[PDB]
Amino acid sequence: GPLGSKNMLLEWCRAMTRNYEHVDIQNFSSSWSSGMAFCALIHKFFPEAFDYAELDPAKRRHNFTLAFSTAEKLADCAQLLEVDDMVRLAVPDSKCVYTYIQELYRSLVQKGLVKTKKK
Known part of the structure:
Protein backbone atom coordinates (compact mmCIF):
# COMPACT_ATOMS: atom_id res chain seq x y z
CA GLY A 1 0.00 0.00 0.00
CA PRO A 2 1.06 3.67 -0.30
CA LEU A 3 1.61 3.52 3.45
CA GLY A 4 2.92 -0.01 4.02
CA SER A 5 2.98 -2.16 7.15
CA LYS A 6 6.66 -2.59 7.99
CA ASN A 7 7.05 1.10 7.19
CA MET A 8 4.46 1.92 9.84
CA LEU A 9 6.24 -0.18 12.44
CA LEU A 10 9.64 1.02 11.30
CA GLU A 11 8.57 4.65 11.46
CA TRP A 12 7.02 3.99 14.81
CA CYS A 13 9.77 1.81 16.32
CA ARG A 14 12.36 4.33 15.09
CA ALA A 15 10.42 7.20 16.61
CA MET A 16 11.26 5.59 19.95
CA THR A 17 14.91 5.05 18.97
CA ARG A 18 15.47 8.82 19.09
CA ASN A 19 15.00 8.73 22.85
CA TYR A 20 17.63 6.01 23.13
CA LEU A 74 4.41 -6.39 32.38
CA ALA A 75 2.57 -7.31 29.14
CA ASP A 76 2.59 -11.12 29.13
CA CYS A 77 3.82 -10.72 25.55
CA ALA A 78 4.33 -13.60 23.12
CA GLN A 79 7.09 -16.24 23.17
CA LEU A 80 7.94 -16.31 19.46
CA LEU A 81 11.65 -15.58 20.13
CA GLU A 82 14.13 -17.46 22.33
CA VAL A 83 17.09 -15.74 23.98
CA ASP A 84 19.47 -18.59 23.22
CA ASP A 85 18.45 -18.60 19.56
CA MET A 86 18.93 -14.85 19.34
CA VAL A 87 22.30 -15.19 21.00
CA ARG A 88 23.38 -18.03 18.73
CA LEU A 89 21.90 -16.64 15.52
CA ALA A 90 22.97 -13.07 16.18
CA VAL A 91 20.72 -12.44 13.18
CA PRO A 92 16.90 -12.22 13.68
CA ASP A 93 14.28 -12.40 10.93
CA SER A 94 12.32 -9.39 9.69
CA LYS A 95 9.25 -11.59 9.94
CA CYS A 96 10.12 -12.64 13.47
CA VAL A 97 10.64 -9.14 14.82
CA TYR A 98 7.70 -7.93 12.81
CA THR A 99 5.49 -10.77 13.96
CA TYR A 100 6.65 -10.22 17.53
CA ILE A 101 6.05 -6.48 17.31
CA GLN A 102 2.72 -7.26 15.67
CA GLU A 103 1.37 -9.14 18.66
CA LEU A 104 2.97 -6.64 21.02
CA TYR A 105 1.57 -3.72 19.06
CA ARG A 106 -1.90 -5.09 19.46
CA SER A 107 -1.50 -5.52 23.21
CA LEU A 108 -0.49 -1.85 23.42
CA VAL A 109 -3.58 -0.79 21.48
CA GLN A 110 -5.92 -2.56 23.88
CA LYS A 111 -3.96 -1.41 26.91
CA GLY A 112 -4.30 2.07 25.39
CA LEU A 113 -0.55 2.48 25.71
CA VAL A 114 -0.01 3.52 22.09
CA LYS A 115 -2.77 6.15 22.41
CA THR A 116 -0.97 8.13 25.13
CA LYS A 117 -0.83 11.54 23.46
CA LYS A 118 -2.46 12.73 20.23
CA LYS A 119 -0.46 14.71 17.67
Missing part, protein backbone atom coordinates in the same frame (compact mmCIF):
# COMPACT_ATOMS: atom_id res chain seq x y z
CA GLU A 21 21.18 5.94 21.74
CA HIS A 22 23.65 3.36 20.48
CA VAL A 23 20.52 2.10 18.73
CA ASP A 24 19.74 2.67 15.04
CA ILE A 25 16.68 0.98 13.53
CA GLN A 26 17.60 0.93 9.83
CA ASN A 27 16.58 -2.70 9.59
CA PHE A 28 14.78 -5.38 11.57
CA SER A 29 17.62 -7.91 11.46
CA SER A 30 21.09 -6.34 11.41
CA SER A 31 20.04 -3.29 13.39
CA TRP A 32 18.89 -5.81 16.01
CA SER A 33 22.09 -7.85 16.29
CA SER A 34 22.79 -5.85 19.45
CA GLY A 35 19.60 -6.99 21.17
CA MET A 36 19.71 -3.46 22.52
CA ALA A 37 16.67 -2.78 20.34
CA PHE A 38 14.27 -5.19 22.09
CA CYS A 39 15.17 -3.70 25.47
CA ALA A 40 15.17 -0.09 24.26
CA LEU A 41 11.81 -0.37 22.50
CA ILE A 42 10.14 -1.77 25.63
CA HIS A 43 11.81 0.75 27.97
CA LYS A 44 9.81 3.34 26.03
CA PHE A 45 6.45 2.24 27.41
CA PHE A 46 7.72 0.78 30.70
CA PRO A 47 9.98 3.05 32.89
CA GLU A 48 9.85 0.75 35.90
CA ALA A 49 11.15 -1.83 33.44
CA PHE A 50 14.85 -1.29 33.86
CA ASP A 51 17.55 1.35 33.55
CA TYR A 52 18.38 1.17 29.84
CA ALA A 53 21.24 3.55 30.52
CA GLU A 54 22.69 0.99 32.93
CA LEU A 55 22.74 -1.76 30.31
CA ASP A 56 25.60 -2.44 27.91
CA PRO A 57 26.07 -4.44 24.63
CA ALA A 58 28.35 -6.67 26.67
CA LYS A 59 25.49 -8.49 28.40
CA ARG A 60 23.36 -9.34 25.36
CA ARG A 61 22.06 -12.62 26.82
CA HIS A 62 20.54 -10.76 29.73
CA ASN A 63 19.25 -8.02 27.41
CA PHE A 64 17.20 -10.53 25.47
CA THR A 65 15.92 -12.39 28.54
CA LEU A 66 15.34 -9.03 30.20
CA ALA A 67 13.48 -7.56 27.25
CA PHE A 68 11.33 -10.66 27.16
CA SER A 69 11.12 -11.35 30.90
CA THR A 70 10.21 -7.70 31.39
CA ALA A 71 7.64 -7.51 28.62
CA GLU A 72 6.18 -10.81 29.80
CA LYS A 73 5.70 -9.82 33.42
Whole structure:
Protein backbone atom coordinates (compact mmCIF):
# COMPACT_ATOMS: atom_id res chain seq x y z
CA GLY A 1 0.00 0.00 0.00
CA PRO A 2 1.06 3.67 -0.30
CA LEU A 3 1.61 3.52 3.45
CA GLY A 4 2.92 -0.01 4.02
CA SER A 5 2.98 -2.16 7.15
CA LYS A 6 6.66 -2.59 7.99
CA ASN A 7 7.05 1.10 7.19
CA MET A 8 4.46 1.92 9.84
CA LEU A 9 6.24 -0.18 12.44
CA LEU A 10 9.64 1.02 11.30
CA GLU A 11 8.57 4.65 11.46
CA TRP A 12 7.02 3.99 14.81
CA CYS A 13 9.77 1.81 16.32
CA ARG A 14 12.36 4.33 15.09
CA ALA A 15 10.42 7.20 16.61
CA MET A 16 11.26 5.59 19.95
CA THR A 17 14.91 5.05 18.97
CA ARG A 18 15.47 8.82 19.09
CA ASN A 19 15.00 8.73 22.85
CA TYR A 20 17.63 6.01 23.13
CA GLU A 21 21.18 5.94 21.74
CA HIS A 22 23.65 3.36 20.48
CA VAL A 23 20.52 2.10 18.73
CA ASP A 24 19.74 2.67 15.04
CA ILE A 25 16.68 0.98 13.53
CA GLN A 26 17.60 0.93 9.83
CA ASN A 27 16.58 -2.70 9.59
CA PHE A 28 14.78 -5.38 11.57
CA SER A 29 17.62 -7.91 11.46
CA SER A 30 21.09 -6.34 11.41
CA SER A 31 20.04 -3.29 13.39
CA TRP A 32 18.89 -5.81 16.01
CA SER A 33 22.09 -7.85 16.29
CA SER A 34 22.79 -5.85 19.45
CA GLY A 35 19.60 -6.99 21.17
CA MET A 36 19.71 -3.46 22.52
CA ALA A 37 16.67 -2.78 20.34
CA PHE A 38 14.27 -5.19 22.09
CA CYS A 39 15.17 -3.70 25.47
CA ALA A 40 15.17 -0.09 24.26
CA LEU A 41 11.81 -0.37 22.50
CA ILE A 42 10.14 -1.77 25.63
CA HIS A 43 11.81 0.75 27.97
CA LYS A 44 9.81 3.34 26.03
CA PHE A 45 6.45 2.24 27.41
CA PHE A 46 7.72 0.78 30.70
CA PRO A 47 9.98 3.05 32.89
CA GLU A 48 9.85 0.75 35.90
CA ALA A 49 11.15 -1.83 33.44
CA PHE A 50 14.85 -1.29 33.86
CA ASP A 51 17.55 1.35 33.55
CA TYR A 52 18.38 1.17 29.84
CA ALA A 53 21.24 3.55 30.52
CA GLU A 54 22.69 0.99 32.93
CA LEU A 55 22.74 -1.76 30.31
CA ASP A 56 25.60 -2.44 27.91
CA PRO A 57 26.07 -4.44 24.63
CA ALA A 58 28.35 -6.67 26.67
CA LYS A 59 25.49 -8.49 28.40
CA ARG A 60 23.36 -9.34 25.36
CA ARG A 61 22.06 -12.62 26.82
CA HIS A 62 20.54 -10.76 29.73
CA ASN A 63 19.25 -8.02 27.41
CA PHE A 64 17.20 -10.53 25.47
CA THR A 65 15.92 -12.39 28.54
CA LEU A 66 15.34 -9.03 30.20
CA ALA A 67 13.48 -7.56 27.25
CA PHE A 68 11.33 -10.66 27.16
CA SER A 69 11.12 -11.35 30.90
CA THR A 70 10.21 -7.70 31.39
CA ALA A 71 7.64 -7.51 28.62
CA GLU A 72 6.18 -10.81 29.80
CA LYS A 73 5.70 -9.82 33.42
CA LEU A 74 4.41 -6.39 32.38
CA ALA A 75 2.57 -7.31 29.14
CA ASP A 76 2.59 -11.12 29.13
CA CYS A 77 3.82 -10.72 25.55
CA ALA A 78 4.33 -13.60 23.12
CA GLN A 79 7.09 -16.24 23.17
CA LEU A 80 7.94 -16.31 19.46
CA LEU A 81 11.65 -15.58 20.13
CA GLU A 82 14.13 -17.46 22.33
CA VAL A 83 17.09 -15.74 23.98
CA ASP A 84 19.47 -18.59 23.22
CA ASP A 85 18.45 -18.60 19.56
CA MET A 86 18.93 -14.85 19.34
CA VAL A 87 22.30 -15.19 21.00
CA ARG A 88 23.38 -18.03 18.73
CA LEU A 89 21.90 -16.64 15.52
CA ALA A 90 22.97 -13.07 16.18
CA VAL A 91 20.72 -12.44 13.18
CA PRO A 92 16.90 -12.22 13.68
CA ASP A 93 14.28 -12.40 10.93
CA SER A 94 12.32 -9.39 9.69
CA LYS A 95 9.25 -11.59 9.94
CA CYS A 96 10.12 -12.64 13.47
CA VAL A 97 10.64 -9.14 14.82
CA TYR A 98 7.70 -7.93 12.81
CA THR A 99 5.49 -10.77 13.96
CA TYR A 100 6.65 -10.22 17.53
CA ILE A 101 6.05 -6.48 17.31
CA GLN A 102 2.72 -7.26 15.67
CA GLU A 103 1.37 -9.14 18.66
CA LEU A 104 2.97 -6.64 21.02
CA TYR A 105 1.57 -3.72 19.06
CA ARG A 106 -1.90 -5.09 19.46
CA SER A 107 -1.50 -5.52 23.21
CA LEU A 108 -0.49 -1.85 23.42
CA VAL A 109 -3.58 -0.79 21.48
CA GLN A 110 -5.92 -2.56 23.88
CA LYS A 111 -3.96 -1.41 26.91
CA GLY A 112 -4.30 2.07 25.39
CA LEU A 113 -0.55 2.48 25.71
CA VAL A 114 -0.01 3.52 22.09
CA LYS A 115 -2.77 6.15 22.41
CA THR A 116 -0.97 8.13 25.13
CA LYS A 117 -0.83 11.54 23.46
CA LYS A 118 -2.46 12.73 20.23
CA LYS A 119 -0.46 14.71 17.67
